[PDB]
Paper text:
NvfI from Aspergillus novofumigatus IBT 16806 is an endoperoxidase that catalyzes the formation of fumigatonoid A in the biosynthesis of novofumigatonin. Our biosynthetic analysis of novofumigatonin revealed that the Fe(II)/α-KG-dependent enzyme NvfI accepts asnovolin A (2) as a substrate and introduces three oxygen atoms, including an endoperoxide bridge and C-3’-hydroxyl group, to generate fumigatonoid A.12 Sequence and phylogenetic analyses of the NvfI homologs and characterized Fe(II)/α-KG-dependent enzymes in secondary metabolite biosynthesis indicated that NvfI shares low sequence similarity (10–15% amino acid identity) and belongs to a different clade from FtmOx1. The active site of NvfI is located in the DSBH core and an Fe is coordinated by the His135-His137-Asp250 triad, which is conserved in α-KG-dependent oxygenases. Further, the crystallographic analysis reveals significant conformational changes of two loops upon substrate binding, which suggests a dynamic movement of active site during the catalytic cycle.
To understand the structural details of the NvfI-catalyzed endoperoxide-forming reaction, we solved the X-ray crystal structures of NvfI complexed with Fe, α-KG, and substrate 2 at 1.9 Å resolution. Interestingly, a comparison of the binary complex structure with α-KG (monomer B, state I) and the ternary complex structure with 2 and α-KG (monomer A, state III) revealed that the residues Ser122-Gly128 on loop I and Trp199-Pro209 on loop II undergo significant conformational changes upon substrate binding. The Ser122-Gly128 residues on loop I flip toward the active site, and Phe127 on the loop closes the substrate binding site along with the movement of Trp199 on loop II. Furthermore, the Arg201 side chain moves toward Tyr116 and forms hydrogen bond networks among Tyr116, Arg201, Asp206, and water molecules. In contrast, Glu208 moves away from the active site to avoid steric hindrance with the substrate, and hydrogen bonds with Lys205 to support the conformation of loop II. In the complex structure of NvfI with Fe, α-KG, and 2, the octahedral iron-center is coordinated by the bidentate α-KG and a water molecule, together with the catalytic triad. Substrate 2 directly interacts with Arg118 and His138 via hydrogen bonds at the C-4’ ketone and C-3 ester carbonyl groups of 2, respectively. The C-9’ carbonyl group of the methyl ester also interacts with Thr133 and Arg132 via water molecules. Notably, the distance between C-7’ of 2 and the iron-center (4.2 Å) is shorter than that between C-13 and the iron (6.5Å), which may explain the formation of the previously characterized side product 4, even though the hydrogen atom at C-13 should be abstracted during the conversion to 1. Furthermore, a comparison of the substrate binding site in the binary and ternary complex structures revealed that the movement of the loop around Glu208 increases the active site volume around the A-ring moiety of 2.
Numbering used by the authors: 2 to 278
């Protein structure tokens, strides 16, 4: 079940054969009598390798994720846990953009779609830890978001280095239960990827994310006891041919944490990233 540097748990995947017929969709809040989806989630046991002993070795080009030290003030953290929207869209966005610029050297970073999560929250499923394995954007979705956020400039930006990240930070520390797991992007096979339309509304309203199916080839990691000063950057899209075009991520129930541990709290923000290395 566990050893010094790994543990075992489960996550929700899609079937390897999902989406070979029609487009997959999942309704977030289906009405009575409405069909919720044309596929089922399937749990699979996964071995989670602790990234802690090799923390500084993981790289956004090689692995599709990286961990970076970046302390923020206790007051910004309490403002965020208080759902202070102005603190998120102002101070925290600025913090994330600046962090991403240190890490990559990018010329331009655009933050969007922040989600503050709390273990079995009341703000719905996007305010709760993610239980299905996903990559936030397909290429089409990343391209669409660049047009939507960057206007005219997109015609030039989309032809050089373009990346999209999820930037994830614990708001209570250390994280014990429901840690964010990330996969070595070199171990994702193209057939593991399944676009799924998340219907927040009656109709498709954006381009979709990828949901993953399980494979024994996938090498899954987690950073044990992650602190509020330790930020996970998880790559959802990259225009450059690098060993990991993307990673994928999801939370899992940790087998060795006490039942009565406090709820996990975190904030994640997506970012479009232009230029850099
Ligand atoms: C339990 O829900 C999760 O596990 C994930 C989640 O928590 C969130 C917040 C999501 O946002 C998505 C899809 C995921 C990754 C889901 C799978 C949808 C639901 C709304 C925002 C869009 C958007 C920003 C328009 O960009 C897109 O490319 C389309 C997909 C996302 C990123
Ligand atoms: O906090 C979680 O459980 C999921 C976070 C996430 O999906 C993201 O950062 O894109
Ligand atoms: Fe995500």
């Amino acid at each position: 079940v566990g050893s010094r540097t790994w543990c075992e748990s489960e996550m929700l995947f899609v079937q390897p054969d999902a989406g070979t017929k029609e487009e997959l969709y999942y309704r977030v809040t289906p009405k009575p009598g409405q069909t919720q989806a044309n596929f089922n989630w399937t749990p699979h046991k996964v071995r989670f390798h602790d990234a802690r002993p090799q923390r500084d070795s993981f790289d956004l080009n090689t692995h599709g994720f990286t961990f970076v030290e970046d302390a923020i003030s206790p007051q910004l953290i309490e403002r965020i846990r208080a759902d202070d929207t102005a603190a998120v869209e102002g101070d925290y966005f600025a913090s994330v953009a600046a962090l991403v610029k240190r890490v990559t050297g990018a010329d331009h970073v655009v933050c969007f779609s922040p989600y503050t999560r709390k273990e079995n929250s009341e703000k719905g499923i996007f305010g709760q830890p993610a239980r299905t394995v996903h990559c936030d954007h397909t290429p089409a979705a990343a391209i669409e978001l660049t047009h939507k956020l960057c206007g005219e400039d997109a015609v030039r930006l989309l032809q050089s280095r373009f990346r999209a990240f999820s930037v994830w930070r614990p708001l209570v520390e250390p994280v014990l239960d429901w840690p964010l797991a990330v996969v070595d992007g070199r171990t994702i096979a193209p057939d593991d990827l399944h676009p799924v339309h998340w219907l927040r509304y009656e109709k498709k309203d954006t381009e979709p994310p990828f949901q993953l199916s399980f494979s024994e080839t996938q090498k899954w990691y987690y950073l044990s006891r992650q602190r509020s000063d330790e930020v996970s950057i998880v790559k959802n899209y990259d225009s450059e041919v690098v060993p990991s075009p993307r990673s994928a991520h999801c939370a899992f129930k940790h087998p060795f944490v006490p039942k009565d541990a406090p709820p996990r709290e975190s904030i994640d923000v997506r970012c479009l990233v232009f230029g850099g290395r």
